A paper describes a structure:
The ten Frizzled receptors (FZDs) are essential in Wnt signaling and play important roles in embryonic development and tumorigenesis. Here we report the cryo-electron microscopy (cryo-EM) structures for FZD1, FZD3 and FZD6, including three structures in G protein-coupled and active states, and three structures in G protein-free and inactive states. Together with inactive-to-active conformational comparison on each receptor, sequence conservation analysis and functional assessment, these structures reveal three FZD family-conserved molecular features (W7.55/R6.32 molecular switch, P6.43 kink and the W3.43–Y6.40 interaction) that may constitute the structural basis of the activation mechanism of FZDs distinct from SMO and other GPCR classes.
Finally, the structures of anti-BRIL Fab bound FZD1, FZD3 and FZD6 (FZD1-Fab-VHH, FZD3-Fab-VHH and FZD6-Fab-VHH) were determined at a global resolution of 3.5 Å, 3.4 Å and 3.3 Å, respectively. The CRD domain is still disordered and unmodeled in these structures, indicating that the CRD domain is flexible in both G-protein coupled and apo inactive FZDs. Through comparison of FZD1-Fab-VHH, FZD3-Fab-VHH and FZD6-Fab-VHH with inactive FZD4 (PDB: 6BD44) and inactive FZD5 (PDB: 6WW229) as well as active and inactive SMO, we found that these three FZD-Fab-VHH complexes were captured in an inactive state resembling the conformation of the inactive FZD4, inactive FZD5 and inactive SMO structures.
Numbering used by the authors:
A (entry chain H): 4 to 228
B (entry chain L): 2 to 213
C (entry chain K): 1 to 120
D (entry chain R): 164 to 399, 1001 to 1049, 1063 to 1118, 412 to 499
The structure:
């Protein structure tokens, strides 16, 4: 079956350079045009590049003009995209799409087959471990009813961190939050859980955070005040 | 240059309903628009091309229509799997591809007011020196809510950040956290801190306060 | 400088259907959203429903879902709230309201007076 | 049910009021004497001017036999048919009741009555001409709608309709001819007294039910259906030619905009409207007339790829090669289409005016025929109830339901059945 595989994403510094690769299985790049479309985190799709391997008809968007470069190889059936002097707003997930040629249905069919798409981010700061802090519920905050426990993790890079409650024992009524970028360029996240009365279960609630690139295992305790 | 204005920036439709999404082209782009489906975390899959033709593989629920410079996607039946983001693309040429802003089709639900809570900082923060106060809204269906921070009835701007979860699986609800960060030199200024929430399910804004 | 008037209701026998209207003067409501709220003794100031503009739809509460319907016409500047299966515990006054934020934050700045309703 | 003053010897076909050997009276059916005189004078007054106008139309035909081509030739057979109709209806006024009436005889104690049957009377010939040419005129209007259809959907000229003229005459004198021989075979000829002619569907309910009113209703349905089909097929092919003209003029004007322009920006901003116009023009449309737009779009593609690479004069040289492709395939197709689609506009306007000026009298005649169809039993019952003592027949038992029909309705029916010949003059002069 015809398919596309993207590779090359990772952490890069501002002003750096990166080369993404899109490999095709099935069709040939000489019979189809290959496009790159980027999606910023929390935003919509915008077209960033395209290539026609039949003759070479490269053109880009106005946001990346004079800053990106696209090419293709027919021997390895691949398309490469190179970015030099990356700005901080170029962090996105990049998707590889296939578009046919005039005339007929192949052109009228738009981007038909899309790759998995790989994520590139602009690393303003190097890696560091998360700091796990408690969010102590107030004693008078709905005494005898449902009260919220929580752990706030701050100042961790890169993005993927996993927060678990009692090694996954409590899963009902939990809410982990999508991480946000601070003004310092660092990541923050909060995890909350609502438990009813019972002196909050009279057990030491724990937050086990997993941050693999910093290989941290901070299993913190949260207690009422 | 050619701009596609996709009007209903967020739709809320239930199972089996009929969904209409519109897209307006600035220029007189011919019947070359494509409607795309994107599930959260994956790549777009083509639904409709040439403004009328269904793709080989997509169900016959989807259909497209063109009226001059207006383009419409109609989903006759809304299966639970058809809850994704839908995009409008004009393709007049390879180098002119401009997308729409996108419509997030969410699940309609009975409106519930948020259960707001506020957390004071910790001793670990004052050992660190960066005070963070968090105020969370729990289980409110319409996402259009807001929260303001009061420091002795004073408004603060630019120092609060909001994080909102996507719609849940069981109850199809939301959860939001507003975090305000101060330095300790900026912490003991005034004595009380309040977070007030306004939501369409709440008549009067609900305030949660704590003194220092 | 803007006012909103409400009508309908009164002393209604149980099980019936009504149609309570609400019309605003002093400002066009082609770019705003209205809402209906309920105030009862014991449990004060409950929420009923919200009507948006033409692009969006209409949203309802939990104890009123399915048995109500909210509609809106912008030429005459009127919004309608409908009743069905009116169980007689709704001995409460009904309030129309208008949102003061175009981004639907629900900020209520022009409430009105509220039409009283008595069932049984 | 028939008095001694109204009884005839048998086996002559006389059938009035569903009883053998009876016939309606000649001078008075239920109207006044002065009212009948005024109605007869009014019929003669319209008849003389109708004969004059229709004879003017036939003289206009006679001054040049090839003046009207076959897309509009059936209007002159329409004119001659309705000139014979008006001539018969004027003969009715001139001859009063000397033809479509039997004579009285005091010695036999019989009264003047309606001729109904063969006998040896010119009323047979009058029925032949009147019914034949009325049905023929209606069928000729149907044929005119057919000829407009042949000039609308399977677009023909004044040659292909000529090659079907023998079959057209065969129909337009065959359905009226066969219907006339059927009605003469079944002995359903009757006689007027108001006007002075002979016709079918006057004192028999079924003859007016499905041998006069039903054929005219079928003709109207067929004609309106064919007219609406022509209108839809002409205004689909008009607006689909209108947008293709708009797509082509926004391509030709923009090609001039490109040619006398500068900079690397407006060459792209103008060519991007060319490509959008070319794709929509391809959708309108034969295989060579879609492959041509296919190679034009690719020619815009070759011009647009040079413009993106910041080459301005090469886009001028690439766009100027579109002029050869336009002349080689289209641009003679438009003024040939705008002529065949604007003589058809004016033909459609004339046939619409003719239809809206002829159908309304025809629809009035259909309505009055329906009115005479409905209340036949009530009218005859009122006749019997009012005319009982002087005819010595037993009076009706019950159900009076007094209803004397109005002179206005029947005079309208005799009025709009003759003004239909006036509609030719508008096309003649």
């Amino acid at each position: 079956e015809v398919q596309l595989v993207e590779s090359g994403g990772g952490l890069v510094q501002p002003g750096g350079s990166l080369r993404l690769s899109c490999a095709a299985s099935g069709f040939n790049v000489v019979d189809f045009s290959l496009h790159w479309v980027r999606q910023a985190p929390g935003k919509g799709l915008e077209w960033v590049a395209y290539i026609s391997s039949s003759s070479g008809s490269t053109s880009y968007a106005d946001s990346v003009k004079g800053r990106f470069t696209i090419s293709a190889d027919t021997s390895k059936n691949t398309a490469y995209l190179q970015m030099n002097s990356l700005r901080a707003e170029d962090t996105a997930v990049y998707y590889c799409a296939r578009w046919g040629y005039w005339p007929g249905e192949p052109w009228w069919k738009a981007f038909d087959y899309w790759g998995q798409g790989t994520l590139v981010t602009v690393s303003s700061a190097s890696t560091k471990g998360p700091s796990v802090f408690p969010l102590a519920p107030s004693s008078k905050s709905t005494s005898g009813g449902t009260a919220a426990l929580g752990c706030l993790v701050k100042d961790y890079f890169p993005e993927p961190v996993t927060v678990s409650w009692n090694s996954g024992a409590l899963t009902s009524g939990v809410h982990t939050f999508p991480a946000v970028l601070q003004s310092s360029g660092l990541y923050s996240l909060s995890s909350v859980v609502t438990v009813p009365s019972s002196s909050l279960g009279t057990q030491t609630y724990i937050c086990n955070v997993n941050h693999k690139p910093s290989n941290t295992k901070v299993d913190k305790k949260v207690e009422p005040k | 240059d050619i701009q596609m204005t996709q009007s209903p920036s967020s739709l809320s439709a239930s199972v089996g309903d009929r969904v209409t999404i519109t897209c307006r082209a600035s220029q007189s782009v011919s019947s070359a628009v494509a409607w795309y489906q994107q599930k959260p975390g994956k790549a777009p899959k083509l639904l409709i091309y040439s403004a009328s033709s269904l793709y080989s593989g997509v169900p016959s629920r989807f259909s497209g229509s063109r009226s001059g410079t207006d383009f419409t996607l109609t989903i006759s039946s809304l299966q639970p799997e058809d809850f994704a983001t839908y995009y409008c693309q004009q393709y007049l040429y390879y180098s002119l591809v401009t997308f729409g802003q996108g419509t997030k089709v969410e699940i309609k639900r009975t409106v519930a007011a948020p259960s707001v809570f506020i957390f004071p900082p910790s001793d670990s923060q004052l050992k660190s020196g960066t005070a963070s106060v968090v105020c969370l809204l729990n289980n409110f269906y319409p996402r259009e809510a807001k929260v303001q921070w009061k420091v002795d009835n004073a408004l603060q701007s630019g120092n609060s950040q909001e994080s909102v979860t996507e719609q849940d699986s069981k109850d199809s609800t939301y959860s939001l956290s507003s975090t305000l960060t101060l330095s300790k030199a900026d912490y003991e200024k005034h004595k009380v801190y309040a977070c007030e929430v306004t939501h369409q399910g709440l008549s009067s804004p609900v305030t949660k306060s704590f003194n220092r | 400088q803007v006012q909103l008037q409400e009508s309908g209701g009164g002393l209604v026998q149980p099980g019936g259907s009504l149609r309570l209207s609400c019309a605003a003067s002093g400002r066009t409501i082609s770019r705003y959203a209205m809402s209906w709220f309920r105030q009862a003794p014991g449990k004060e100031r409950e929420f009923v429903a919200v009507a948006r503009r033409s692009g969006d739809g209409a949203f309802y509460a939990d104890s009123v879902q399915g048995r109500f319907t909210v509609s809106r016409d912008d030429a005459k500047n009127t919004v309608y709230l409908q009743m069905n299966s009116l169980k007689p515990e709704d001995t409460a006054v009904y309030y129309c309201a208008i949102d003061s934020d175009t981004f639907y934050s629900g900020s209520y700045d022009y409430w009105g007076q509220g039409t009283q309703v008595t069932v049984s | 049910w028939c008095p001694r003053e109204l009884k005839i010897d048998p086996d002559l076909g006389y059938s009035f009021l569903h009883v053998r050997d009876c016939s309606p009276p000649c001078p008075n059916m239920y109207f006044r004497r002065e009212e009948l005189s005024f109605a007869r004078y009014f019929i003669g007054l319209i008849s003389i001017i109708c004969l004059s106008a229709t004879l003017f139309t036939f003289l206009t035909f006679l001054i040049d036999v090839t003046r009207f081509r076959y897309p509009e030739r059936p209007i002159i057979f329409y004119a001659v048919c309705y000139m014979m109709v008006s001539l018969i209806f004027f003969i009715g006024f001139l001859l009063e009741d000397r033809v479509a009436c039997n004579a009285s005889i005091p010695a036999q104690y019989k009264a003047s009555t309606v001729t109904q049957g063969s006998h040896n009377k010119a009323c047979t010939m009058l029925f032949m001409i009147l019914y034949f040419f009325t049905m023929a005129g209606s069928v000729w209007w149907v044929i005119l709608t057919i000829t407009w259809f042949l000039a609308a959907v399977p677009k023909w000229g004044s040659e292909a309709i000529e090659k079907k003229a023998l079959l057209f005459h065969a129909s337009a004198w065959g359905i009226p001819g066969t219907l006339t021989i059927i009605l003469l075979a079944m002995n359903k000829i009757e006689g007027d007294n108001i006007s002075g002619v002979c016709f079918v569907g006057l004192y028999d309910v079924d003859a007016l039910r499905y041998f006069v009113l039903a054929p005219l209703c079928l003709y109207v349905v067929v004609g309106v259906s064919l007219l609406l089909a022509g209108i839809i097929s002409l205004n689909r092919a008009r607006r689909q030619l209108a947008d293709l003209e708009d797509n082509w003029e926004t391509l030709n004007d923009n090609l001039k905009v490109i040619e006398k322009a500068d900079n690397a920006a407006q060459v792209k901003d103008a060519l991007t409207k060319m490509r959008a116009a070319a794709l929509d023009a391809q959708k309108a449309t034969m295989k060579d007339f879609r492959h041509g737009f296919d190679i034009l779009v690719g020619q815009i593609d070759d011009a647009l790829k040079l413009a993106n690479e910041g080459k301005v004069k090469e886009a001028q040289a690439a766009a100027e090669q579109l002029k050869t492709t336009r002349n080689a395939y289209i641009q003679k197709y438009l003024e040939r289409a705008r002529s065949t689609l604007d003589k058809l506009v004016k033909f459609m306007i004339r046939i619409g005016v003719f239809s809206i000026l002829y159908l309304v009298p025809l629809l009035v005649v259909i309505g009055c025929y329906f009115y005479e169809q409905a209340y036949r039993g009530i009218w005859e019952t009122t006749w019997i109830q009012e005319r009982c003592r002087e005819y010595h027949i037993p009076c009706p038992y019950q159900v009076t339901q007094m209803s004397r029909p109005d002179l206005i309705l029947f005079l309208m029916k005799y009025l709009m059945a003759l003004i239909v010949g006036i509609p030719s003059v508008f096309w003649v002069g």
